[PDB]
PDB file of N, CA and C and ligand atoms in Angstrom:
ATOM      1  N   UNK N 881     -76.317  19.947  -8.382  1.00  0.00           N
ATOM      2  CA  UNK N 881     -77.376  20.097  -9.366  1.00  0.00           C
ATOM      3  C   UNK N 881     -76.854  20.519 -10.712  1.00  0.00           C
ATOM      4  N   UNK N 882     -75.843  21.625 -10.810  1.00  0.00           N
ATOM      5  CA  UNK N 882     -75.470  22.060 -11.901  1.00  0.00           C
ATOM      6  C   UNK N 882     -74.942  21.090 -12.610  1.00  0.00           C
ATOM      7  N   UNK N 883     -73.699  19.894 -12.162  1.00  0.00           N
ATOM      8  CA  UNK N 883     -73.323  19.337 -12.804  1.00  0.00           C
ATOM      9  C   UNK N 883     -73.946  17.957 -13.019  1.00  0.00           C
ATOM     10  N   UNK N 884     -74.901  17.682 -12.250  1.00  0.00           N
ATOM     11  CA  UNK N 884     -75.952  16.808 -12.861  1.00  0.00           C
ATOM     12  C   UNK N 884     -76.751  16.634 -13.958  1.00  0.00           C
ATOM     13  N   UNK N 885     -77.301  18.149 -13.931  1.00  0.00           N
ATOM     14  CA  UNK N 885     -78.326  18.344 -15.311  1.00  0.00           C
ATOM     15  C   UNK N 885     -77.227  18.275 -16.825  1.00  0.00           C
ATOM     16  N   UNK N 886     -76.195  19.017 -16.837  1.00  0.00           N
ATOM     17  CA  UNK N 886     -74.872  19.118 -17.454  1.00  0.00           C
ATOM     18  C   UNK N 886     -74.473  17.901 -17.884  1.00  0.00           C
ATOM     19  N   UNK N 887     -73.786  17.387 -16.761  1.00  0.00           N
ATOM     20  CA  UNK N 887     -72.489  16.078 -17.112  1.00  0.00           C
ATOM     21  C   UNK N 887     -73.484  14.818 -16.222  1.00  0.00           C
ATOM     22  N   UNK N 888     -74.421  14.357 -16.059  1.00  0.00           N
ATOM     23  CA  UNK N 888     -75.259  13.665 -15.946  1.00  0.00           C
ATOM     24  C   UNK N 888     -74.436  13.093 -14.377  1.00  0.00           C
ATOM     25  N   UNK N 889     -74.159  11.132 -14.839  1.00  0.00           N
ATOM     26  CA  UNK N 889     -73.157  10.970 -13.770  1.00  0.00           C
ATOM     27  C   UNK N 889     -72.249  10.798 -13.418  1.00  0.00           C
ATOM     28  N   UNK N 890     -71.558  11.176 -14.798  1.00  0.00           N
ATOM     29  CA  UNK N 890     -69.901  11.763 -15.087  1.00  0.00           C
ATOM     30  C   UNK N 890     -69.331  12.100 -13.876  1.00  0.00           C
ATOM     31  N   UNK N 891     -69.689  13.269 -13.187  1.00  0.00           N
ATOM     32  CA  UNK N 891     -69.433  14.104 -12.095  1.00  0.00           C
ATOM     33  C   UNK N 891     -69.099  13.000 -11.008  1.00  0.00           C
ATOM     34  N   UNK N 892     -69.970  12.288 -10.310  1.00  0.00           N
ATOM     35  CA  UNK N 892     -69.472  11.460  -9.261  1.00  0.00           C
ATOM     36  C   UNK N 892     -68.752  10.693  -9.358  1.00  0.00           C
ATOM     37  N   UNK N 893     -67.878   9.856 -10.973  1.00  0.00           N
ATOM     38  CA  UNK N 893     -67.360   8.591 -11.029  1.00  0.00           C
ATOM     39  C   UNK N 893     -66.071   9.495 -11.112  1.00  0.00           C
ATOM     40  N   UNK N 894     -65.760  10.745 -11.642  1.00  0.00           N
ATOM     41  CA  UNK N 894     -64.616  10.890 -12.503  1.00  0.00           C
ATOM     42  C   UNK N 894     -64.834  12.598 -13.084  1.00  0.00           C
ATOM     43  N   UNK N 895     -63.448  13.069 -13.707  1.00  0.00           N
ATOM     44  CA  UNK N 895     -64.183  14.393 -14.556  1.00  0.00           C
ATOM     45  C   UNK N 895     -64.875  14.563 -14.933  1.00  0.00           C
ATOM     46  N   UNK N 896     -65.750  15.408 -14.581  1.00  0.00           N
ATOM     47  CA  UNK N 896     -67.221  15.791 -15.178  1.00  0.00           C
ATOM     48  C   UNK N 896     -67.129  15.814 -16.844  1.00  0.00           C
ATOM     49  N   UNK N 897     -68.121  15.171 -17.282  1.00  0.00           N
ATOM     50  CA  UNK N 897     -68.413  15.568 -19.424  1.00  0.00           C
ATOM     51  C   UNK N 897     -69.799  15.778 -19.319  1.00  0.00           C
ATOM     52  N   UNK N 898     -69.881  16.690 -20.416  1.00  0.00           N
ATOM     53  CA  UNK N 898     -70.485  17.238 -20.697  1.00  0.00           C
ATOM     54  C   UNK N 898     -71.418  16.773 -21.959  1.00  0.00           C
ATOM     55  N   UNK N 899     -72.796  16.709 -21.623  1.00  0.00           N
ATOM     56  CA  UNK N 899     -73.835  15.625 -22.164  1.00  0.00           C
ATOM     57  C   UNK N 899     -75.014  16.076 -22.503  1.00  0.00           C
ATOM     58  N   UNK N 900     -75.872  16.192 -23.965  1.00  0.00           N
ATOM     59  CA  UNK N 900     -77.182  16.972 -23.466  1.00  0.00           C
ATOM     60  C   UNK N 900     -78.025  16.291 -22.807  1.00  0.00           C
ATOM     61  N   UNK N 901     -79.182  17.363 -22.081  1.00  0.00           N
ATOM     62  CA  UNK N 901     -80.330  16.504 -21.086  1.00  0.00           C
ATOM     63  C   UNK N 901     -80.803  15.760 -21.939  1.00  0.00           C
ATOM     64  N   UNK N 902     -81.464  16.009 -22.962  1.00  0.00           N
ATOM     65  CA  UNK N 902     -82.182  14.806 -23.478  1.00  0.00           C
ATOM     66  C   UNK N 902     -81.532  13.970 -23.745  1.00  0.00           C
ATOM     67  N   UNK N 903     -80.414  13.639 -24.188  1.00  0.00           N
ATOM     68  CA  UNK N 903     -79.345  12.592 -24.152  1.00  0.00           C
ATOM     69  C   UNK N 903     -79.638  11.908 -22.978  1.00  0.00           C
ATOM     70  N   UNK N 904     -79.517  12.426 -22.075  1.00  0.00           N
ATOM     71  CA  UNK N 904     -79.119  11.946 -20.826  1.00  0.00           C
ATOM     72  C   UNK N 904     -80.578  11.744 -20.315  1.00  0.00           C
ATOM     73  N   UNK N 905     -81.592  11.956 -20.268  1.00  0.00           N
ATOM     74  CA  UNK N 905     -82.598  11.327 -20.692  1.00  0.00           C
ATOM     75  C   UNK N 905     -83.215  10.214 -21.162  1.00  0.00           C
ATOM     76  N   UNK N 906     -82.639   9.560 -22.035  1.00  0.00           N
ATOM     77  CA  UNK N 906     -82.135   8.436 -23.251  1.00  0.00           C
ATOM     78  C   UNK N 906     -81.417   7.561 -22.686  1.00  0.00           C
ATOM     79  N   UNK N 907     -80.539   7.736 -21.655  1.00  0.00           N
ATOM     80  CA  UNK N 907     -79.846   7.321 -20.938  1.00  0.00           C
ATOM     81  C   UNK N 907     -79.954   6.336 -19.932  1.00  0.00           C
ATOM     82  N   UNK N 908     -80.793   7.272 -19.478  1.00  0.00           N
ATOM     83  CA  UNK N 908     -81.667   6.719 -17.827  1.00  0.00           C
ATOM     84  C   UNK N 908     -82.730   6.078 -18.243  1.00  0.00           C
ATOM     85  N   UNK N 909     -83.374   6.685 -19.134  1.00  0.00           N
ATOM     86  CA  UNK N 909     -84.850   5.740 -19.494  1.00  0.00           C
ATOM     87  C   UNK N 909     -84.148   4.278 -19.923  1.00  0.00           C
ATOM     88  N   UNK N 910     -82.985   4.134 -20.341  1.00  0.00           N
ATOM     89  CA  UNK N 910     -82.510   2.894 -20.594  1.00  0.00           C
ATOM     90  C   UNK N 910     -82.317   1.937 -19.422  1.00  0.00           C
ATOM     91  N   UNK N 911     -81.707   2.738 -18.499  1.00  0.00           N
ATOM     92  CA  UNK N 911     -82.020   2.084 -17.334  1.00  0.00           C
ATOM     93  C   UNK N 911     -83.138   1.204 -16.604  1.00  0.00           C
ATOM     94  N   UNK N 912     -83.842   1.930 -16.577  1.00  0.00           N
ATOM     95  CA  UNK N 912     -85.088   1.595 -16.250  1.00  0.00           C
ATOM     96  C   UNK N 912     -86.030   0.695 -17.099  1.00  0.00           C
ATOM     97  N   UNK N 913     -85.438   0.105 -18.211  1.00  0.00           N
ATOM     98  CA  UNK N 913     -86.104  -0.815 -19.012  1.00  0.00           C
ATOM     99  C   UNK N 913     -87.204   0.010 -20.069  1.00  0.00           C
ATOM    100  N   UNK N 914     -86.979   1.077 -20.306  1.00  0.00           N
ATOM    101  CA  UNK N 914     -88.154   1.704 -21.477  1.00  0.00           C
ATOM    102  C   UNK N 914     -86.348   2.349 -22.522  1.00  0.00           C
ATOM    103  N   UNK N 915     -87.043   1.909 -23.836  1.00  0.00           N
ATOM    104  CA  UNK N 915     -86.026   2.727 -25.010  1.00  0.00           C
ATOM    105  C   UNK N 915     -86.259   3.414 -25.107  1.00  0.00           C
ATOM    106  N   UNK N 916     -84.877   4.150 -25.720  1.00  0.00           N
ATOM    107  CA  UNK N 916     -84.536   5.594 -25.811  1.00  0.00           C
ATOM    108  C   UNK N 916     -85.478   5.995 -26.932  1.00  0.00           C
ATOM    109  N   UNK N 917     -85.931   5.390 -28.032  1.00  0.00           N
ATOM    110  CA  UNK N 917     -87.391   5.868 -28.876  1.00  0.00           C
ATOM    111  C   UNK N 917     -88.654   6.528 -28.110  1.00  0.00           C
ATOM    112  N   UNK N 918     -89.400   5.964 -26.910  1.00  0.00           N
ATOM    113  CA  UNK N 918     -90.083   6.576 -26.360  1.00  0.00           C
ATOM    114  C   UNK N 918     -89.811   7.690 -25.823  1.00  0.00           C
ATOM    115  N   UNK N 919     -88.599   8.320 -25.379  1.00  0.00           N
ATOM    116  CA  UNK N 919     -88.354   9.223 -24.993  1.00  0.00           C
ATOM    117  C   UNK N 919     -88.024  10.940 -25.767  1.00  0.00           C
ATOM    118  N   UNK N 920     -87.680  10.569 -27.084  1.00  0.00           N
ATOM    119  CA  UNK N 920     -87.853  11.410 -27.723  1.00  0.00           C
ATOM    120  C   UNK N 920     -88.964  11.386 -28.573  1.00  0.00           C
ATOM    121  N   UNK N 921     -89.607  10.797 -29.018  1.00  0.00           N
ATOM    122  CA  UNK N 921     -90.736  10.991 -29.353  1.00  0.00           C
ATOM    123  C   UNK N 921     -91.552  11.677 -28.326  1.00  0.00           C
ATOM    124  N   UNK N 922     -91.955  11.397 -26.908  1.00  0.00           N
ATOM    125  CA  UNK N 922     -92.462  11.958 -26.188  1.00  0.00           C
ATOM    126  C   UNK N 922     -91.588  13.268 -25.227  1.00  0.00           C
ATOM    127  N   UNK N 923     -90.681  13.562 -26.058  1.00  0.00           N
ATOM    128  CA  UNK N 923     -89.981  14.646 -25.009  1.00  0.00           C
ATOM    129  C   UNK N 923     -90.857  15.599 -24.920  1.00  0.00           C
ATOM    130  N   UNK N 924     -91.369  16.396 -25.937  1.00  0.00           N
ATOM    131  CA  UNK N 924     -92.514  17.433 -25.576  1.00  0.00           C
ATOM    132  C   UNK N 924     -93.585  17.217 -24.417  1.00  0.00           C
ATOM    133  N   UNK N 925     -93.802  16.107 -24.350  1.00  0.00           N
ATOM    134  CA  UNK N 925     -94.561  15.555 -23.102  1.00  0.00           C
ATOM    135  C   UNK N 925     -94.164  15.280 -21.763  1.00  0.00           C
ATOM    136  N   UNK N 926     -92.801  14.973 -22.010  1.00  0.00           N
ATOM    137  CA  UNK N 926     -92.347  14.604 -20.864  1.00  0.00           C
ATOM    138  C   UNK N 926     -91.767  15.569 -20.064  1.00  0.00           C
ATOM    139  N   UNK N 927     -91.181  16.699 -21.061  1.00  0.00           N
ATOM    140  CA  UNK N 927     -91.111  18.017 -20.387  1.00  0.00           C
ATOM    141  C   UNK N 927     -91.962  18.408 -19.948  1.00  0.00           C
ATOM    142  N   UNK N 928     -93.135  18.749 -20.060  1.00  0.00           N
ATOM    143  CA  UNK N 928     -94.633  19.192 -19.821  1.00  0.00           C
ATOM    144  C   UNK N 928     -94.774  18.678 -18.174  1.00  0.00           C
ATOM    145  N   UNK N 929     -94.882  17.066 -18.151  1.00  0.00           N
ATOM    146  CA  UNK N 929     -95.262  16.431 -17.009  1.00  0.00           C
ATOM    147  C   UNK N 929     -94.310  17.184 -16.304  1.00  0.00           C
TER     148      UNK N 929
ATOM    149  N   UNK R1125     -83.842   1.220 -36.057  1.00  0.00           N
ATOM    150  CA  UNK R1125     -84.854   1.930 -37.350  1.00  0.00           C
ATOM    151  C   UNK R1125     -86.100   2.522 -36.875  1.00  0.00           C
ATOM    152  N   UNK R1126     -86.359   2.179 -35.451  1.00  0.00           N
ATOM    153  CA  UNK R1126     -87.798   2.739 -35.026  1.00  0.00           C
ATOM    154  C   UNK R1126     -87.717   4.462 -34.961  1.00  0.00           C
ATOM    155  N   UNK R1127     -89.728   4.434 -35.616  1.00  0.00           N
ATOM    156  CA  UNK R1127     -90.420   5.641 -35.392  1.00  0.00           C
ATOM    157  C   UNK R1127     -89.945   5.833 -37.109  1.00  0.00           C
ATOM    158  N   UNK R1128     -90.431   7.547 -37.362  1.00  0.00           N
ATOM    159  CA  UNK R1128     -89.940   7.947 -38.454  1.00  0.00           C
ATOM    160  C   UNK R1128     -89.764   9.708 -38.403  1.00  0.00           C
ATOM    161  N   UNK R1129     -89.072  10.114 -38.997  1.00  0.00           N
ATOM    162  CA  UNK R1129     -88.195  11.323 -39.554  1.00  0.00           C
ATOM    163  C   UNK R1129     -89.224  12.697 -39.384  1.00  0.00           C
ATOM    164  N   UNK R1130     -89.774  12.886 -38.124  1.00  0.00           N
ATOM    165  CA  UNK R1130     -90.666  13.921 -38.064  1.00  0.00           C
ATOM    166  C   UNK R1130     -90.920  14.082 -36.458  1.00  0.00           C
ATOM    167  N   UNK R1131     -90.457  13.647 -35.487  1.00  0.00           N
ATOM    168  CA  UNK R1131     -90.698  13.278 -33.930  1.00  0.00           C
ATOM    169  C   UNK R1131     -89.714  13.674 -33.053  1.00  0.00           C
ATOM    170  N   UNK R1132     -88.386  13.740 -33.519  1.00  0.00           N
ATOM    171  CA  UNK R1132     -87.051  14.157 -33.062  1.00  0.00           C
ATOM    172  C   UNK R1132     -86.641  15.618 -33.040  1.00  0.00           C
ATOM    173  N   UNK R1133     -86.342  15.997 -31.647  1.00  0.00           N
ATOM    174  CA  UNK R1133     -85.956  17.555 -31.560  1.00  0.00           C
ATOM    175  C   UNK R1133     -84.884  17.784 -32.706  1.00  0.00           C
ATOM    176  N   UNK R1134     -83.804  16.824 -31.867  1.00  0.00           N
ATOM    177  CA  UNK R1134     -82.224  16.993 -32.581  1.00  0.00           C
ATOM    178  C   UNK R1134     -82.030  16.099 -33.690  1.00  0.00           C
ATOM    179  N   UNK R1135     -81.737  16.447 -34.864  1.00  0.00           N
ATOM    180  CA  UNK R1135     -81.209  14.945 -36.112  1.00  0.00           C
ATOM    181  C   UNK R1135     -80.692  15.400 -36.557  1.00  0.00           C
ATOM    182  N   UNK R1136     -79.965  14.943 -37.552  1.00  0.00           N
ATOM    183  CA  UNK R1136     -78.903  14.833 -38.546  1.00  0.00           C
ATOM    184  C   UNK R1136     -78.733  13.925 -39.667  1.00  0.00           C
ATOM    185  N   UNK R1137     -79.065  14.365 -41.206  1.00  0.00           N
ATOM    186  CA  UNK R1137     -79.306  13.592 -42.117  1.00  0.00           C
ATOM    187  C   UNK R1137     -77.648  12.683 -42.617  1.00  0.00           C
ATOM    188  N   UNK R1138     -77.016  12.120 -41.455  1.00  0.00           N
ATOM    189  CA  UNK R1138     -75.661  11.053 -42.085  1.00  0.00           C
ATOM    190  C   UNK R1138     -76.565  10.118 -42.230  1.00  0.00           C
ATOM    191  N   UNK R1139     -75.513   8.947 -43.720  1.00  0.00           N
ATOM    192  CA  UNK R1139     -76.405   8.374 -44.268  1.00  0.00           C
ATOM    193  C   UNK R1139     -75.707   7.130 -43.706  1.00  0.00           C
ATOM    194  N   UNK R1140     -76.737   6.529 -43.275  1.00  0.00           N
ATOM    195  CA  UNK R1140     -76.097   4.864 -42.645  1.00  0.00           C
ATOM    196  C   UNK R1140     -75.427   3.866 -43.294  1.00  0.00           C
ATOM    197  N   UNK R1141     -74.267   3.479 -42.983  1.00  0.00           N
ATOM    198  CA  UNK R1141     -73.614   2.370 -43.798  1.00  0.00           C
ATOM    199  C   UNK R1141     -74.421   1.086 -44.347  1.00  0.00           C
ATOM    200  N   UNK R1142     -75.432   0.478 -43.335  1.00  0.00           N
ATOM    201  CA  UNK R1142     -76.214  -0.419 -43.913  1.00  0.00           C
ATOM    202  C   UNK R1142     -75.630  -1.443 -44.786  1.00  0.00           C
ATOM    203  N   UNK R1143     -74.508  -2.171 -43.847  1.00  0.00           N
ATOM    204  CA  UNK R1143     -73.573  -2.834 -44.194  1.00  0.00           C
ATOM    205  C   UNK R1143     -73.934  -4.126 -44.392  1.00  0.00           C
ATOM    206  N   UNK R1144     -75.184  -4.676 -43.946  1.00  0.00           N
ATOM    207  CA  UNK R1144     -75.863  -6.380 -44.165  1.00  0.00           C
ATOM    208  C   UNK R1144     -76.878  -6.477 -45.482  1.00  0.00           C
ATOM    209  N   UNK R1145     -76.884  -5.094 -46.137  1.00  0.00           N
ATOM    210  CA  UNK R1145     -77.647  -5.535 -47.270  1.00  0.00           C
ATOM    211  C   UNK R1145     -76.650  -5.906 -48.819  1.00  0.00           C
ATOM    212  N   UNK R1146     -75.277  -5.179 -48.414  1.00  0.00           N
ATOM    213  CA  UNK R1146     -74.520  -5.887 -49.730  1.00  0.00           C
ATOM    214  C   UNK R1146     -74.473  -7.114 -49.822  1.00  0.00           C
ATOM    215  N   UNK R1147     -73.943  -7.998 -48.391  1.00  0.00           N
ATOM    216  CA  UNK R1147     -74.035  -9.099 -48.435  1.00  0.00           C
ATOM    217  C   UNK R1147     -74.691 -10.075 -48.496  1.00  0.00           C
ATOM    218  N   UNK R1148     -76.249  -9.915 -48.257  1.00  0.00           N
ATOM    219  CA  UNK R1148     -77.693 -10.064 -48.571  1.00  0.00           C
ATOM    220  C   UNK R1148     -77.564 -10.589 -50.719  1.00  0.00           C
ATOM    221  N   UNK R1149     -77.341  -9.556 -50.919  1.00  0.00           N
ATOM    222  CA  UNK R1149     -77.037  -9.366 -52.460  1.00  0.00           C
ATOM    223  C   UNK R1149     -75.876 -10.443 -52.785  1.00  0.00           C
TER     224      UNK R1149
ATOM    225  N   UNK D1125     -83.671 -19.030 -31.514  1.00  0.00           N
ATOM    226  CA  UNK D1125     -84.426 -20.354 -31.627  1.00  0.00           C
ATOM    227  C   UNK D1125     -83.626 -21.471 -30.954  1.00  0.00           C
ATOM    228  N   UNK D1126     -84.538 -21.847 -29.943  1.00  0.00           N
ATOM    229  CA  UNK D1126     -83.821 -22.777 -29.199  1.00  0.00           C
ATOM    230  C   UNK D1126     -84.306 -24.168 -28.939  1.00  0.00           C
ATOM    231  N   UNK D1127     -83.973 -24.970 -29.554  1.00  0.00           N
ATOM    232  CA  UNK D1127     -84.441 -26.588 -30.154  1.00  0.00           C
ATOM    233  C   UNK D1127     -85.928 -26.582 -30.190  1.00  0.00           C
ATOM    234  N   UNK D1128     -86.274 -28.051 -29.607  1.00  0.00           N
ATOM    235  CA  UNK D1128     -87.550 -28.388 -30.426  1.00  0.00           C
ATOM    236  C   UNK D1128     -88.555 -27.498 -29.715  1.00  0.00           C
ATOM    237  N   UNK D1129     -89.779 -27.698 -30.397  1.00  0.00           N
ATOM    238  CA  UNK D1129     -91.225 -26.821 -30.082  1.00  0.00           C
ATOM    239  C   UNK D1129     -91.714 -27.745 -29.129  1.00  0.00           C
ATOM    240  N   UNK D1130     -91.772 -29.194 -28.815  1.00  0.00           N
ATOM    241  CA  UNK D1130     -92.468 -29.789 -27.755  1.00  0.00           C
ATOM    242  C   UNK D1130     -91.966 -29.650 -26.174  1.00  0.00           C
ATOM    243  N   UNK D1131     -90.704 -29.421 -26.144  1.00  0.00           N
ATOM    244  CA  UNK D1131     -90.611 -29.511 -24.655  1.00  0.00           C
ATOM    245  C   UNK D1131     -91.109 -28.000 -24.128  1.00  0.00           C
ATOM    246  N   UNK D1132     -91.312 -26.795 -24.472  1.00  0.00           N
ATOM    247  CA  UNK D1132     -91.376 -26.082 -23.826  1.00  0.00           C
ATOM    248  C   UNK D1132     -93.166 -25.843 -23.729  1.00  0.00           C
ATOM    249  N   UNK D1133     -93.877 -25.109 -22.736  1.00  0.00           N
ATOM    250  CA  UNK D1133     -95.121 -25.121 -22.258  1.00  0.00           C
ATOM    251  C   UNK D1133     -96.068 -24.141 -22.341  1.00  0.00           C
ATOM    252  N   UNK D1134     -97.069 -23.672 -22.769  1.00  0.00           N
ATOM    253  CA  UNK D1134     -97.698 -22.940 -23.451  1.00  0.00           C
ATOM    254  C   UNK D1134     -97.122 -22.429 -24.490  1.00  0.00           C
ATOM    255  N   UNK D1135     -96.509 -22.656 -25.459  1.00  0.00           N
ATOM    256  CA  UNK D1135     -95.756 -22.547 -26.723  1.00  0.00           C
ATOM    257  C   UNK D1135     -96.997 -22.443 -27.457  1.00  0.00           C
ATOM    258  N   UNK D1136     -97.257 -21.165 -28.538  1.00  0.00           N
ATOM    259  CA  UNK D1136     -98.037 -20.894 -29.323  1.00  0.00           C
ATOM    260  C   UNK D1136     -98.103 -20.810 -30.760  1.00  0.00           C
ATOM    261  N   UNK D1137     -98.706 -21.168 -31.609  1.00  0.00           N
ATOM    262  CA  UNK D1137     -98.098 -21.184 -33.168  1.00  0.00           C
ATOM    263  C   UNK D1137     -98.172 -20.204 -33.982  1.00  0.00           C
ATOM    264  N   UNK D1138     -98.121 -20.449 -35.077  1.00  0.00           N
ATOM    265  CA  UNK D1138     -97.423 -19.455 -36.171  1.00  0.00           C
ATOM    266  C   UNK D1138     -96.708 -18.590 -36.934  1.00  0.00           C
ATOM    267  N   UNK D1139     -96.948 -17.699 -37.530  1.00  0.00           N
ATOM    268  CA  UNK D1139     -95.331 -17.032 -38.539  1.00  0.00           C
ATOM    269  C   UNK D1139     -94.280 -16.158 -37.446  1.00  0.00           C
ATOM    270  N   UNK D1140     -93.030 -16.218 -38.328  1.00  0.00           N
ATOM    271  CA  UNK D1140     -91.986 -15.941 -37.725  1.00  0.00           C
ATOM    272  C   UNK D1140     -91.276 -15.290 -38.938  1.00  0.00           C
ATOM    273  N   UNK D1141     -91.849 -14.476 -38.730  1.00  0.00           N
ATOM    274  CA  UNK D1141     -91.205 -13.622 -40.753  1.00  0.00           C
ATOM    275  C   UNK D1141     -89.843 -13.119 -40.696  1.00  0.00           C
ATOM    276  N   UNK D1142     -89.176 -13.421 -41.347  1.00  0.00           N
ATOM    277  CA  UNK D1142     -87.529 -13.158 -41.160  1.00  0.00           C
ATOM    278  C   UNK D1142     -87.131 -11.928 -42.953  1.00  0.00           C
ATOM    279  N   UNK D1143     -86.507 -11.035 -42.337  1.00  0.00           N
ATOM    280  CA  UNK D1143     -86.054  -9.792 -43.833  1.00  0.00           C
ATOM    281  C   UNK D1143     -85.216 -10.436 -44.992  1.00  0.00           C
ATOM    282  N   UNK D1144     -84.234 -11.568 -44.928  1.00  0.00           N
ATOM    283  CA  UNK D1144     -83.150 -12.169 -45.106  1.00  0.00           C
ATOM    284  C   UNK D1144     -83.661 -12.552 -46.566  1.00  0.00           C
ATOM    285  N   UNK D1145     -84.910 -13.754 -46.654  1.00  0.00           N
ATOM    286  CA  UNK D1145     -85.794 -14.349 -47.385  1.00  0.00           C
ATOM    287  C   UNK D1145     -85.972 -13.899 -48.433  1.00  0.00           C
ATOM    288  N   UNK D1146     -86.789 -12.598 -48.569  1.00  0.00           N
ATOM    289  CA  UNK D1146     -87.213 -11.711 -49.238  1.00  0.00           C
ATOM    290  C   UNK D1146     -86.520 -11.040 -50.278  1.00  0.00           C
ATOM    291  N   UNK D1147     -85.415 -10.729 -49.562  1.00  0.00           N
ATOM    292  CA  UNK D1147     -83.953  -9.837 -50.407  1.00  0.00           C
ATOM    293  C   UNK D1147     -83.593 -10.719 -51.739  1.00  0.00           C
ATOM    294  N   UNK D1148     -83.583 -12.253 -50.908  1.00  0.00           N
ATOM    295  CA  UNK D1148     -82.600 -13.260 -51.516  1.00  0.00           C
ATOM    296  C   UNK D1148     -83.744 -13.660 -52.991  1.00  0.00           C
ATOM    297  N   UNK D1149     -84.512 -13.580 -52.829  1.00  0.00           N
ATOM    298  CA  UNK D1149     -85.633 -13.847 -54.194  1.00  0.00           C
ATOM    299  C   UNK D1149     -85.954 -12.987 -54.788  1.00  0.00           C
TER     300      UNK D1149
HETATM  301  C1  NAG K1201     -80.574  23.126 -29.813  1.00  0.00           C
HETATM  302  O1  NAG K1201     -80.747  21.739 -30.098  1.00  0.00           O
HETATM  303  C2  NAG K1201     -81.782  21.464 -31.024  1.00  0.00           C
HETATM  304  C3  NAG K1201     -81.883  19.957 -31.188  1.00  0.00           C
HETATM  305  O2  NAG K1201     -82.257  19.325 -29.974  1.00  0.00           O
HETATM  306  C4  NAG K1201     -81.455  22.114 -32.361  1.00  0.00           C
HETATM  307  O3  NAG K1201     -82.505  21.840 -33.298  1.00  0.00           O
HETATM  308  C5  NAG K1201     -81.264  23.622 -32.209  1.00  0.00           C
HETATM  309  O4  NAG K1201     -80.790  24.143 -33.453  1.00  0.00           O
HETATM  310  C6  NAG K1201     -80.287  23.933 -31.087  1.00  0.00           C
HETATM  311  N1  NAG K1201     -80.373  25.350 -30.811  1.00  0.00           N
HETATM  312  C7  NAG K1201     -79.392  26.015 -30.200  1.00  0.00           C
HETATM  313  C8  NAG K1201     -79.627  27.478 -29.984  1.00  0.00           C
HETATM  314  O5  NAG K1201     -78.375  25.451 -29.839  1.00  0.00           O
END
């Protein structure tokens, strides 16, 4: 957990780096087909949920 | 370029190269 | 843009505003 929230999925491929959450946030929402714009715009929200 | 300059926790005012409008000119 | 407007199927019309145009005039 620690080095998840931290170094996102750094940790399992290789030396852990060090990344902010909302970065990493930005990240994953990319994944999933939504841009990294919605996500900070709605971070206050999305923290909330 | 999306959104605008009021929505973002973290920013930083560096100023973008905006390298396709010289050549535009 | 990928060739002509007839072969493809429910193809819908109108503007296609491009930044490029504008600069240049
Ligand atoms: C934390 O990060 C935010 C941007 O997301 C920044 O505005 C703030 O100054 C930082 N604060 C600390 C204590 O690091």
């Amino acid at each position: 957990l620690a080095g998840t929230i931290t170094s996102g999925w750094t940790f399992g491929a290789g030396a852990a780096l060090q990344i902010p959450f909302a970065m990493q946030m930005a990240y994953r929402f990319n994944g999933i087909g939504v841009t990294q714009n919605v996500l900070y715009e709605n971070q206050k929200l999305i923290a909330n949920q | 370029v999306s959104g605008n300059c009021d929505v973002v926790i973290g920013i930083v005012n560096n100023t973008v190269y905006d390298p396709l409008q010289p050549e535009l000119d």
